[PDB]
């Protein structure tokens with residue numbers, strides 16, 4: 001790019017390559033995402049454009065939408081590190097509980113904001129949760145899923161992670177709700193606590209069965225309507241639910257209680273981000289500074 005002097009390729013996102021770039025007009029460092037294709041839908045341009053107005057301290061700012069040369073670029077504020085790399089970096093010691101709690105609190109504020117504005121993320125994962133040196137954490141890519149579509153890999157063959165996908169999505173429900181983001185965040189919360197992914201499925205069915213083996217195969221009692229879902233099969237094995245005490249030790253009871261509410265099978269029974277912010281788990285929440293190696 002001419003208006004931007006690439007510093008480095010940050011990696012490959014859901015929709016295309018992402019670079020760390022410098023705006024030659026401002027000297028500002030940003031995250032430039034190329035959106036991988038037969039003209040670029042206008043409905044997309046308009047939708048995405050509306051996202052530029054979404055501002056909240058826990059949402060990565062979408063600075064600009066650039067549609068030129070029949071190519072589409074998204075310009076985002078640049079952040080220091082992603083949660084995935086931070087978790088890997090804290091693997092030996094684990095993230096201190098006060099920081100895990102601060103991050104969860106902030107992420108829920110982010111979701112509460114987006115959800116009140118009717119914007120869903122739909123693909124939350126450690127890779128798109130970004131942190132800075134001051135102890136803030138922000139969600140990147142809210143709303144892109146709806147505006148754009150749903151790719152198999154990314155754009156050039158790249159295994160898309162299914163680890164954080166809500167059960168209703170795996171069972172073929174076509175209408176997503178804000179609850180899919182709460183499910184993903186719950187999975188992320190568990191992963192910060194145990195230092196191991198909660199449901200590391202390697203295929204849609206493996207993903208679904210790992211969920212069932214832990215929370216029990218859902219039925220009409222715990223999830224009214226589940227047996228009528230598009231990809232539900234009466235032949236699904238019937239696994240008993242396991243005790244949460246065994247799932248996220250050594251998380252205390254308030255934490256376990258909150259997580260159970262974020263992982264309810266019925267999307268309608270799953271706790272909302274706003275209600276979760278009032279959960280007693282956050283009664284002693286603070287904002288610690290993390291030890292970031294940049």
Ligand SMILES: C=CCNc1nc(N)c(C(=O)c2ccc3ccccc3c2)s1
Pocket residue numbers: 010011012013014018031060076077078079080081082127128130140141
């Ligand atoms: C982690 C250091 C780079 N700083 C970033 N700042 C922003 N704003 C980023 C992203 O918005 C982002 C989010 C998800 C990604 C997933 C794969 C590859 C690059 C990705 C980039 S990444």
